[PDB]
Amino acid sequence: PGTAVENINTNVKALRKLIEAKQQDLAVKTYNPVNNGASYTIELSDGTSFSMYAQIAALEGGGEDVVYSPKVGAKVEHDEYYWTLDDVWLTFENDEKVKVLDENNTVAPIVDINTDGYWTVKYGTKSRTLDKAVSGKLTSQFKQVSTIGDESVSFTFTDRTPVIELNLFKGDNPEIPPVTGALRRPISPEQPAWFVHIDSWNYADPQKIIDLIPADIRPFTIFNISLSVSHDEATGIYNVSEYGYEIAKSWLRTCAENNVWAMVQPSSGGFSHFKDVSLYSQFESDDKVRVYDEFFREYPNFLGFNYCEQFWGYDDQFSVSWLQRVAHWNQLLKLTHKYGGYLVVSFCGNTWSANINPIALVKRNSDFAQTAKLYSENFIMCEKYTTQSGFFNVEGICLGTWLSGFAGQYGIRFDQCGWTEEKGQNGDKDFPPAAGALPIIEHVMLTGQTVIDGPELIWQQCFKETNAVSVGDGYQSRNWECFPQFVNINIDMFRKIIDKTIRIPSRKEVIDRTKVVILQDVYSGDDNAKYSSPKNLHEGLYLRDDDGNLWDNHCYFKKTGRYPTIPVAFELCDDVANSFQYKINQSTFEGSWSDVNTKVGKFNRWFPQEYTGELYAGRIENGWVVYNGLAGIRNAAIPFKYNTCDKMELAYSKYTVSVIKEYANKLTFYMNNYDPSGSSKTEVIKIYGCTSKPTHSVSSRANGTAQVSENWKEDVYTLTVTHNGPLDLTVNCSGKATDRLTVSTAASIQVPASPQIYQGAYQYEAECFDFKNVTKRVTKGDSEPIRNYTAQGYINFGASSAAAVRDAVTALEDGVYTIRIRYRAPSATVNTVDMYINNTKVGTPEFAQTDNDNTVWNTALMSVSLRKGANTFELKANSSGAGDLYLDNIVIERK
Ligand SMILES: O[C@@H]1[C@@H](O)[C@H](O[C@@H]2[C@@H](O)[C@H](O[C@@H]3CO[C@@H](O[C@@H]4CO[C@@H](O)[C@H](O)[C@H]4O)[C@H](O)[C@H]3O)OC[C@H]2O)OC[C@H]1O
Ligand SMILES: OC[C@@H]1O[C@@H](O)[C@H](O)[C@H]1O
Ligand SMILES: [Ca+2]
Numbered sequence: 001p002g003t004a005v006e007n008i009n010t011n012v013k014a015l016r017k018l019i020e021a022k023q024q025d026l027a028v029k030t031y032n033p034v035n036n037g038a039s040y041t042i043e044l045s046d047g048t049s050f051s052m053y054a055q056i057a058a059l060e061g062g063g064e065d066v067v068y069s070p071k072v073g074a075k076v077e078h079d080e081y082y083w084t085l086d087d088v089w090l091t092f093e094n095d096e097k098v099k100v101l102d103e104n105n106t107v108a109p110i111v112d113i114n115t116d117g118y119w120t121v122k123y124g125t126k127s128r129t130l131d132k133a134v135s136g137k138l139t140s141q142f143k144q145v146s147t148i149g150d151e152s153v154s155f156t157f158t159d160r161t162p163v164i165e166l167n168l169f170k171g172d173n174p175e176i177p178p179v180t181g182a183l184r185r186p187i188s189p190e191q192p193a194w195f196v197h198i199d200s201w202n203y204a205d206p207q208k209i210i211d212l213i214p215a216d217i218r219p220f221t222i223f224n225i226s227l228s229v230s231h232d233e234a235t236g237i238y239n240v241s242e243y244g245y246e247i248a249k250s251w252l253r254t255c256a257e258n259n260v261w262a263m264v265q266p267s268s269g270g271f272s273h274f275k276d277v278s279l280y281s282q283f284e285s286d287d288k289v290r291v292y293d294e295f296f297r298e299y300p301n302f303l304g305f306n307y308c309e310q311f312w313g314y315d316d317q318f319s320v321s322w323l324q325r326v327a328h329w330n331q332l333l334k335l336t337h338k339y340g341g342y343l344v345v346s347f348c349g350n351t352w353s354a355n356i357n358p359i360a361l362v363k364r365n366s367d368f369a370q371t372a373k374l375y376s377e378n379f380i381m382c383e384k385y386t387t388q389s390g391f392f393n394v395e396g397i398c399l400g401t402w403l404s405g406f407a408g409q410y411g412i413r414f415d416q417c418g419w420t421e422e423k424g425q426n427g428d429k430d431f432p433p434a435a436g437a438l439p440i441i442e443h444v445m446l447t448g449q450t451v452i453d454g455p456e457l458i459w460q461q462c463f464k465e466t467n468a469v470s471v472g473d474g475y476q477s478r479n480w481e482c483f484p485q486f487v488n489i490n491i492d493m494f495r496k497i498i499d500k501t502i503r504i505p506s507r508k509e510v511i512d513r514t515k516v517v518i519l520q521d522v523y524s525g526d527d528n529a530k531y532s533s534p535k536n537l538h539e540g541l542y543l544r545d546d547d548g549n550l551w552d553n554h555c556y557f558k559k560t561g562r563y564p565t566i567p568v569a570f571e572l573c574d575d576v577a578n579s580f581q582y583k584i585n586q587s588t589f590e591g592s593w594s595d596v597n598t599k600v601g602k603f604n605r606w607f608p609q610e611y612t613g614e615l616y617a618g619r620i621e622n623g624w625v626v627y628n629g630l631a632g633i634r635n636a637a638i639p640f641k642y643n644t645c646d647k648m649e650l651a652y653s654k655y656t657v658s659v660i661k662e663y664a665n666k667l668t669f670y671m672n673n674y675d676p677s678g679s680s681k682t683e684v685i686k687i688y689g690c691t692s693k694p695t696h697s698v699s700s701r702a703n704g705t706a707q708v709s710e711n712w713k714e715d716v717y718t719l720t721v722t723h724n725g726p727l728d729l730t731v732n733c734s735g736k737a738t739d740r741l742t743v744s745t746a747a748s749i750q751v752p753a754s755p756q757i758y759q760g761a762y763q764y765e766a767e768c769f770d771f772k773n774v775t776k777r778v779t780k781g782d783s784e785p786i787r788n789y790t791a792q793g794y795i796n797f798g799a800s801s802a803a804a805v806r807d808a809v810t811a812l813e814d815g816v817y818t819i820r821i822r823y824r825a826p827s828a829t830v831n832t833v834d835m836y837i838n839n840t841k842v843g844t845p846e847f848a849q850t851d852n853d854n855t856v857w858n859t860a861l862m863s864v865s866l867r868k869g870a871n872t873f874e875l876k877a878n879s880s881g882a883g884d885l886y887l888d889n890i891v892i893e894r895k
Contacts, residue, residue, distance in 0.1 A: 001785065002854070004059040004069070004138055008111045010855050011142045012072045014042070014052045016108040017851075018155055018164045019074060019081050019100050027169040028153040031145050032245055033288060035237050036275060036318070040145050041788050045169050047820070047859030050851075051788045052142050052155075057235070061135030068131055069138040070119050072109050073161035074100050083109055085121060085130075087160050092126040147287045173894070176759045178297045183377060184340045185222070185261050185303055187409050187450050189504035190750045192497055194490075195263065195306070195344075195411075195453040196221050198251050200228040200241040202463050203779045203792055205768035206254040208480045209463060217494055219751050223262040224306055225251045226458070229271035229313070236318030239782040244273030245291055246790040250765060250889070256301045256758035257810060263344065264295060265306040269313020276320045276328035283335050292332065296339035301755035304341035304378075305332065308413070309386055311353040322356045323365070330368045337375040346382035346413045346453065347398060349390040351551045354527040357394070358401045359520045363531065363570045372406045373573045381407040382453055385418035385439065391556035392543065393533045396518075396568045399447055403511055403580075405573030411451025412443050416461060420554045426631040426654060433461065433485035434655040434673050437493060438616075438627045439556050441657055445502050445625050446618050447565050448510040455490060462486045475770040475806050478779070488674040488702045488725045495701075501670050501728075502659055503747045505620060508576055513620060515606055516582040518568040518589070533568045534589045540596040541566070541603060544629075557629025561618025563607050582606070611638040615652055622743050624660040628652040633682075642743055643667060645735035646689025653681035663743055665734040672726040674704070685719040687733050693717075694733040701726040757812065759894075764807050764873070766887035767793040773802040773877075775884065786886065788855045790822070794888045797833070799881030806874045809892055811866035816895040819873070821860045821887065824850050828883035836874040837864045845875075847885055857888055863895060 020026075027045040034040065038055040059067070073084040081100040083090035089097045090109060098109070109123045119130040143156040147168065155164040187193045194217065198209045206223075213221050225248050228240035241247055248264045255262035266273040274291045277283070283293045295302045307329070314322045329343060336343045347358055354360070358381055362369035372379055383398040385391065402410035419431035428435075436455055443449050455461050461483055468476040482491075496502045505513065518537070522530050528550070535550045542558035543549070568586075572578045584593065593599045611617045613636035617626045622642045628634045636650045642662035652658070656673040673681045687694065694717045700706045704725025711718040717733060767779050775798025778784050786794060797803055811817065819835070830847035845860040873890065 001783065002057055002787065004057045005112060006854060007053045007056045008069060008138075008141075010051055010853055011053055011140060012108045012111065013851060013853050013856075014050055014142070015072070015074055015161070016100055017048065017050060018166070021166055022164060023101065025167070027167040029169040031153065032290075033145075034243065034245070037144065037288065038236070042145065047861070049788060049822070049857045049859075050853065051855035052145070054140050054142060054144060055235075056138040056140050058137050059133065059135050063134060063136030065136050066139065067134045067136030069133075070111050070121055070130055071141045071159045072111060072121065073141055073157060073159045075161065083123075084159070084161065090121070090123070092123065092128055098123055178339065179300045179756055180339055182340050184300065184755065185752060187342075189448070189450060189506055190748045191752045192220060192450045192452070192504060193222050194220055194494055195224040195451065197224045197226045197454065197458040197462065199226045199458040199463070200247060200792065201226075201459045202465060202480065204251070204480070205478055205765070206251040207258070207768070208478070210255070210258050210260060212463065212480060212482055214491065216498065217491060218260060219754065220494065220498065221260065222303060223255050223260055224265050224453070225255070225262055226265045227273050229268045229273075231271065231318065238273065240780075241273065241792065242782040243790065243792075247792060248291075248295070250763045250791040252295060252299050252302055253761065253763040256299045256755075256760065257762045259301065259754050259757065261301050261303055261755055262299070263303050263306050263342070265308055267307045268309050269311070270316060270319030270322070270325065271313050272307075272319070276324055277331050278324070278327050280331045280334050283331070292335055296335065296341060298760055300758060302341070304336050304343055306344040306346075308346045309348055309384055310345055311348055311350065311356065311387070314356070326361065326365045326368050330365070330371050333371050333375050333379055337378045340378075342378055342380050342409075344380045344382060344411075346384040347394060348384040348387040348418075349394045350387055351528065354531040357531050358397050359568065359570050360531040361401075362406050363520065369406065369570075376405055377408040379407045380409045380411060380451060382411040382413045382451060383443075384413040385415040385556065386456070387418065388420060389551045389554050391418065392538045392553055393550055395443065396533055396537070396566050399565055400517065400567035400569035402448075403507060403514070403517065403567050403577065404569035404571060405577045406570070409450050410448060411453055412440055412449050413453035413456065414440055415454065415456035417456065418556065425555050425557070432655060432675070433489055434675060436461075437489050437657045437672055437674075438629060438655070440493065441502065441659060442558070442616070442618065442625050442627070443565070444497070444504055445623065445659065446505075446513075446561070446620055448505040448507060450504055452494070462490070471770050473806075475772050475804070477770040478768060484676050484703065485674060488704060489672065492672070492702045492726045496659065496670050498749055500747050500749055501661060501668065503621070503623060511576065511580060514564045514567060515580070516566060516584065517572070517580045518566065518584050518586050519572070520568060520570050521585045521587050534586060534594065536594060536596060537566060540600045555629075557627075558616050561616050561625065562609060563603055564618075610641070611636050613637055613650075615650060622662040622741070624662075625657070626650060626652070626660060627657040628654050630654065640737070640740070642741050643733065643735075644737045644740055645687050645733050646737070649686040649688070651684040653683060656681060656683055664740065665732065667731040667733060669729040669731070670726070671721065671723065671729060672704075673723070674725040678724055680705075680722055680724050683721040683723070685721065685731070687717045687731065688715070689735040689737075690715060690717055690733050691735045694731060696729065696731050698727055698729045701728060759812075761891050761893040762809065763790070763889055763891050764809060765791045765793070765889045766795045766797075766805065767791065769795070769805040769807045769887070771795070771806075772804050773800045774798050774805070775800070785854050786824070788857060789888050791889070794886055797875070797885040797887050799884055801877050801880045803833075803881075804874060804876040805887065806872065807890075809866070809871050809873050809890075811868060811871060811892075814868050815865070816863055817866050818893045818895050819862045819864060820891040820893070821845055821862070821875075822857050822889050822891070823847055823860060824857055824886035825883055826850055826852050826886075830881050830883060830885045832879045832881050833875050833877050833885060835862055835864075836872070836876060837866065838872050849883075866892075
């Protein structure tokens with residue numbers, strides 16, 4: 001959006017305002033570069049906010065060269081600023097100069113193109129025609145804003161307009177010391193984490209996504225503030241998340257206010273809202289990258305940055321090389337470590353991205369490798385299921401990153417998108433949500449994942465905005481709901497972690513179960529040879545008969561669980577890593593292990609057979625993950641290792657997953673197969689070798705249905721389980737065996753502590769206010785003409801006598817607060833809107849007429865008493881407005 005001419009005039013009006021701010025000694029309160037400094041937002045101390053453009057939109061019509069455009073600058077003579085045109089005095093008729101500040105006029109010279117295609121400049125009733133305007137790229141009259149010492153802020157221009165220096169606002173409240181040192185929010189088997197997205201694509205009200213997470217889950221949740229990298233190809237400008245900084249800031253404040261942990265996700269490919277660094281020093285001394293230190297310093301609940309699907313979109317005009325991104329991570333991990341945060345990376349692969357996978361990450365970047373090793377506690381590596389192939393290759397490597405000591409936690413970011421295009425799997429073209437439970441439960445339980453991220457797509461599998469709903473007193477409000485699969489698969493699965501059914505193994509427990517690791521020591525050949533796992537590594541182990549090797553591996557369901565996920569690492573960094581029983585150098589792999597039959601033989605000696613059948617069954621201690629990844633009813637015969645009976649025989653429907661806990665005289669089964677459309681599945685369970693009549697009991701979970709029939713005949717107990725969705729089934733069954741293992745003491749789950757209380761300003765977006773009788777609600781601002789808003793939109797409150805907005809705000813304590821209302825009133829002052837706090841009128845804000853420009857906002861202040869806890873904010877028209885009133889947000893702050 002936004003034309004050349006609008007950009008040009010925006011800068012003219014900015015110049016006037018800067019010169020007025022100079023003379024009135026206004027300070028710059030804040031400034032922020034956007035789209036890599038293509039533009040900046042400026043806030044002054046009087047509440048005026050506006051944009052300046054270092055880059056100008058091309059003049060329509062598709063010229064490719066740099067062409068002329070009028071440069072309206074300003075120069076001082078005899079103590080006063082006068083306007084320039086292309087570095088000569090701007091004159092009209094008189095040859096008389098025109099003063100920037102005249103107090104008569106409030107209108108700056110306006111640049112335009114007339115009907116004959118000539119540039120024009122107008123001031124008052126006076127007009128001058130300049131050169132023909134030809135289509136092409138233009139240059140700005142404005143260069144950059146930057147900070148000098150830490151006293152001052154300098155605006156620089158491209159045309160001999162002198163530097164304009166303004167004071168930087170020395171703030172009046174005392175500094176809140178940040179959380180530093182220890183991890184802010186420890187993650188472990190005892191304290192798993194779910195990264196739940198507050199997503200730009202849901203156009204979220206952060207408060208409403210937060211409140212969709214039930215109370216028992218919230219303390220284990222880390223809210224992932226997700227900025228989309230959707231952008232215009234030609235200019236680089238972000239659309240969906242036009243203002244990343246502003247989105248992240250607003251949603252992080254809401255998180256902080258809610259006392260919930262949060263991260264920001266500024267990057268999907270190479271693409272990022274925030275500039276990459278090369279030197280640690282930049283975090284404090286470079287005004288282009290303030291965001292990194294700011295979020296850590298100001299929000300004790302902030303944990304850090306999430307760089308997702310780091311496999312694509314490098315070396316674009318508007319992104320960095322992958323090498324640059326790693327050098328960024330090298331410094332950011334240091335910053336992260338200081339503040340006790342996490343840097344999260346996720347990876348999904350293809351054949352072209354071998355040289356940027358988690359092996360290459362450390363094997364090609366020795367400096368990063370060193371930092372990673374030193375600060376591993378602060379670094380989290382996640383397998384992502386977004387691509388079409390290589391699932392086992394990428395699983396093994398992401399696991400290897402953790403087990404080898406380069407990453408301190410291992411996670412999964414599951415995604416519907418990894419369902420094979422066209423044909424799907426098992427004859428199912430469309431992705432069935434039930435499929436998604438299988439890798440998550442398997443990799444958590446058997447490979448020690450402490451982080452679950454998503455699942456994706458957030459806006460299809462997790463949350464959706466509905467139409468507005470009534471909320472009382474004539475107001476409506478935006479509404480979000482959970483997708484049924486989120487409740488019936490993801491929330492319920494996490495509860496099964498919390499309730500100790502699904503015990504997560506520690507790194508050391510995983511290493512001892514896994515036994516074997518491949519070390520990627522190959523420096524000859526192509527990128528796959530040097531960074532990917534051996535082609536045929538999974539063949540004849542857990543690769544399905546209908547699926548192929550490496551980049552022909554299109555299915556993430558394992559054929560058997562006899563063999564652990566096979567980790568692949570670069571190097572083993574610490575003594576724990578070096579305790580692996582079997583170390584295979586990949587350079588020897590083609591020699592010995594590439595012959596499938598030879599490998600299966602040696603693996604079959606290391607890993608004994610503990611069941612038979614076509615189901616996936618894998619065992620850790622007294623716990624089994626058993627699932628059906630194939631079409632049709634599939635079966636397993638599993639001798640008991642802890643239960644005193646003999647064996648269980650299982651017959652499971654397609655996509656039925658189960659976690660089975662063995663006890664001496666008891667079995668539990670967590671079972672799920674959730675279909676949103678309500679189909680019923682049949683499973684069968686047979687226990688052999690009972691020495692008395694068993695009993696059972698069952699409870700459906702979430703929105704699930706179940707019915708269980710039992711049968712005792714000969715010495716065989718059969719349970720037939722009809723269900724949709726999740727259930728817990730208990731079987732009380734004992735036999736004679738004395739040669740059984742002993743169940744461990746109950747595992748530890750520790751509800752993670754809350755963050756430190758946030759002492760800062762709270763923010764509330766108008767586009768999230770409850771409303772009635774407003775002109776327009778802009779929930780997606782990028783397509784509309786107003787710039788320089790916060791979060792993803794704003795509203796046009798409009799001029800109706802019946803117009804009103806409401807919101808629920810909070811206060812830590814009773815006392816006096818400033819409410820800053822960020823508004824626009826572009827055609828006349830508005831004095832017909834009253835503010836209510838807790839259903840009592842507290843005053844009439846002075847919505848003073850603002851400049852016409854598309855970039856200009858201002859702020860009206862009000863002091864009120866709030867009480868501790870929940871308060872009601874309202875703005876209500878009492879009569880027709882003299883003009884339209886736009887609202888962006890309110891900011892509430894202790895006075
Ligand atoms: O709306 C936005 C989405 O369009 C955007 O989607 C990305 C998607 O574009 C990305 O696709 C990757 C692109 O890279 C390919 O690899 C290339 C293949 O050709 C080679 O010659 C080249 O060297 C190589 O890099 C991958 O095949 C392909 O999967 O996947 C991720 C997805 O998020 O994302 C942002 C949205 O806002
Ligand atoms: O627009 C970027 C998308 O949002 C992120 O959360 C996803 O992983 C990426 O695919
Ligand atoms: Ca807003």
